[PDB]
């Protein structure tokens, strides 16, 4: 995020870090339940990548994070890589996340749900802070 | 990428107004947000765009794409979750 601010640790508990086997953070995701994570189809997740839940500071060896393995990747078959439309993938965990103060689910909207323009929402992540 | 988790507040835009920036690249399963002095950027993809509805945070967008330079004056594009929740529900149920 460019011009964001540091979050209070553990305050966005559904936020996970998608990392490769070397520990490199490449995308975010959200826990929607103990066994499933929603992320973008263009993230190109494979079952060799790791779901890291509970993390705040990626440079700390003393946080109690949860490194979870991925059982199966479900890329929405309507995802259109050319237009980046329907950019959604679901990840089924082989090891269920253990929900706690810092690890919990985000809510899903109803298909009929209304979020008006002008509404102030929040986005989180470990993406670039400057370009 | 920063070591610590960042956050930012940003407003939702209309697809119509989003089109003023992105034109026809803006499809229906997408929602824009930002152009407010903040921007999602490389490495934020796949993470959440949440809106509080009735006191609970709800997933409205999935960080998807936007400006190649993370321009804060251009809106970021998110996968529109209301357009995809049906698919999520079916998958979770069949698996």
């Amino acid at each position: 995020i460019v011009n964001g601010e540091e979050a209070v640790p553990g305050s966005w508990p559904w936020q996970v870090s998608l990392q490769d086997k070397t520990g490199f953070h490449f995308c975010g995701g959200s826990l929607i339940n103990e066994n499933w994570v929603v992320t973008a189809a263009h993230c190109g997740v494979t079952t060799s990548d790791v779901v890291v839940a509970g993390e705040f500071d990626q440079g700390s060896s003393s946080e109690k994070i949860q490194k979870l393995k991925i059982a199966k990747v479900f890329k929405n078959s309507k995802y259109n890589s050319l237009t980046i439309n329907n950019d959604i993938t679901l990840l089924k965990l082989s090891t269920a996340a253990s929900f706690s103060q810092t690890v919990s689910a985000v809510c899903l909207p109803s298909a009929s749900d209304d979020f008006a323009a002008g509404t102030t929402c929040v986005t989180t992540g470990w993406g670039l802070t400057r370009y | 990428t920063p070591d610590r988790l960042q956050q930012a507040s940003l407003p939702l835009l209309s697809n119509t107004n989003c089109k003023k920036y992105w034109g026809t690249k803006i499809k229906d399963a997408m929602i824009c947000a930002g152009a407010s002095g903040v921007s999602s950027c490389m490495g934020d993809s796949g993470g959440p765009l949440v809106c509080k509805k009735n006191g609970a945070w709800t997933l409205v967008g999935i960080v998807s794409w936007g400006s190649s330079t993370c321009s804060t004056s251009t809106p970021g594009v998110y996968a529109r979750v209301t357009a995809l929740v049906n698919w999520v529900q079916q998958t979770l149920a069949a698996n």
Partner: peptide, 4 residues
């Protein structure tokens, strides 16, 4: 317009 780059992916993120």
């Amino acid at each position: 317009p780059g992916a993120y």
